[PDB]
Structure formats: C-alpha cells, structure tokens
Assembly symmetry: C4
Homo-oligomer: 103 residues x 4
Amino acid sequence: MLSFLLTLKRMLRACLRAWKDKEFQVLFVLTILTLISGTIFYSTVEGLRPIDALYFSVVTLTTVGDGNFSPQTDFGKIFTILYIFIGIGLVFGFIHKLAVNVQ
Amino acid sequence: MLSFLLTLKRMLRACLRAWKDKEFQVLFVLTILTLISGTIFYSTVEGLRPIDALYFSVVTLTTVGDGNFSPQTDFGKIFTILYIFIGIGLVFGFIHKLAVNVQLP
Amino acid sequence: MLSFLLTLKRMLRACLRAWKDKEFQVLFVLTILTLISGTIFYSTVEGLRPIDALYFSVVTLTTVGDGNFSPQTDFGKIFTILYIFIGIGLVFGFIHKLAVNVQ
Amino acid sequence: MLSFLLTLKRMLRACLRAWKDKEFQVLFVLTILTLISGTIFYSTVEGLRPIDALYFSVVTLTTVGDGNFSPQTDFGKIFTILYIFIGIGLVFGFIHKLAVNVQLP
Ligand SMILES: [Ca+2]
Ligand SMILES: [K+]
Ligand SMILES: [K+]
Ligand SMILES: [K+]
Ligand SMILES: [K+]
C-alpha cells in the first residue's frame, strides 16, 4: 500500500531530522564515546577480546544484560556500576530530548 | 467494582483506538519485521532452533535478556549489538508517539 | 532538614493520590493479575515451585531477567514471549498515564 | 565542532541545574538509600561479598540483571521482587519529574 510507504517515509525523514539536532548529536556522541571506553576498559581490566568487551558494554549500557559474563575483578564491578548509571543518565537525556521535541 | 469494569473498557477501547493510527501500525510492522529477521538470523548463523531464535530475539529486543544463551560467533555478536539499537529505536519511536498523542491540542 | 522531609511527604502524598485514580488502579490490577497468571503458568507448565514461578514472572515482566532459569518447554517459551509484550504494553500504559497526569 | 562543545556545556549545565531541584534530590537520596539497603540485605541474607551485594543490587534495581547470580533463599527471592518494584517506582518518579519540567508553562 502507498499509504503505508508514505507514512513510513514521513517518519524516517522525522528520524533523520533528529540527527540534525545539535543536542541529539551530543547525546549520540556521548554514548558512542561511552561505548568505546567500556570496550577498552573491559578489554584491558577484565581481559576480554575487544569484540566481547564491546558486546558486554552494549548489553550492559542498554540494560539487556549478559546471561553468562559478569565482571570478575573488583575494579570491574565498580566500573560496571557507574557505567550503568551513565547509561541511565544517557537514556533520560534522550527521553527528555523527545519529551521536549513535541512542544 | 463497576467503575473498575467501566474504566477498563474505556481504556481497552483506547488501546484499540490507537491500533488504528497509521504511525503506530508501521512501528508494529517494523517490530514484527525485526522479530522475524532475528529469528531467521539466529537459527541460521547461531544454529538455534527456530523457536529459540525467536525467543532470544524477543528477550534481546526488549532488554529482558536471555539468562543462558549468548551468541557464540563474532558475527552473531555484531548483529546482536545493532539489533539492540534497532529495538531501542523502535521503543523511542513508540514513546515519541505516545508523547505526541498526549501533548496534542 | 525539615525542607527535605516536607518535600518527601508532598511527593508521597502525590503518589498516594494516584492509587486513588481509577485508570491507575486498573493498570495496577491488570499487572497483579498478570503476575498471578504467570506464577500459575510457570508453576504448572514449567514445574517451578510457586515462589520460583512468581520470581521468574516478575523478573521477566519487568525486563530484569533471570540469570539462570529459561523456559524449557516450547509452550513455556511461547507464553514467555507474549507475556513480555503484555509487560511492554502494561508499562506503556503507566507511561501514558503519567504523561497525561501533568497536563 | 565548536557548537558541539558549546551545546554539550549548555546541556551539562542543565543536568547540574536539575541537581538543584528539591524533588530530584530526594529521589536521588531514596535511590542511594535503596541501594544501601540492598547491599546490606544481600551480603547478610544471601551471604554475598559486600561489593557483590551492591553490584547485584544495582543491576537488579536497574533491570540490567545479573547473568550469574540469583537469590538462593525464599527470603532473598521475596525481597528481590519488592526491591524491583521500588526501583520501578523510583524510575517512574524521575520520569514523572522530567515530564513536569518539560510541560511546564
Ligand atoms: Ca547464566
Ligand atoms: K539477564
Ligand atoms: K532491562
Ligand atoms: K526500560
Ligand atoms: K535485563
């Protein structure tokens, strides 16, 4: 149906308009950064291959969680705790962003 | 007791009333599409029984998470990461939607 | 500090005012129901002691997840999938509720 | 590049500006209180090393979840359930807050 495609595209364009918003860009960059850091941290401190460090970081920053791995070192656990709150703060940021975008 | 039932019905009506929104519908189809892709991907690449691939896909895409399985291949891992952001995208989309339907006038 | 206690109490009263809202009551009852059902389902179909069925239901309906148990039977898995979406729908319900409560 | 930095700072200022809200503060203290209680509870009742009790408490209260540990006692289980709803309460509270600070005027 054309109605369907048209609606989808209207929405896609709306999503694209966001990647053009400075504040949204910031939020985006910060999480990308946060993802890099985490990848690096768990790679060195917890000794996980980069890909498994990125995975754990993602799955953790998004609250999906890893059904197998858990930080072994104490330093790892502390970092993971603060890491998670950064994620909570990051998502509220987007939430607030969207809540404002309508008005 | 009666107001409970009456309120429930009014709300239950609304949920359906929103099931008529063109944008809600697309989000729904996109989610179902995402769910189907995941199911295929994981049964294929991770060799998971189809029902296990759909299950992993659902719990992964909703941030619930699987307490036992994790992709074993680097391929599955990469896909899961992006898959999760799709999910995050889908949910914000719904949230944005609800946000608009509230602050309407 | 008195300022602190006063603010807290103002907020507690606000939370209490909600338990007096019919629509909120509904949302509440539905999840309680949903929790009962789940407890029963996983108890019989997956053979978990009621307490472990309630736990799995809660941890699953709230997206916390169980780091050990996963449904073994196919019927269990299908139910868990629909169960989770009920939860997503239930939480959006509260979300919408709150988003309206301000205006 | 400069607008990035300038925007970041303006936003970074706001987060702090909100750290001055009396209601945000209480929510924060309540969360810290909840976190401390959990840490005590789990090290005591579940015999978890203090840092493991705080960790389990954080991942549990944020719906992230622990991929390896689960309370072993029926006592720990009951507590975890309520604990999770406290967390759900805390988050809605913050959300409600953000909701109000947006739709202000
Ligand atoms: Ca596990
Ligand atoms: K998990
Ligand atoms: K979650
Ligand atoms: K969430
Ligand atoms: K989770």
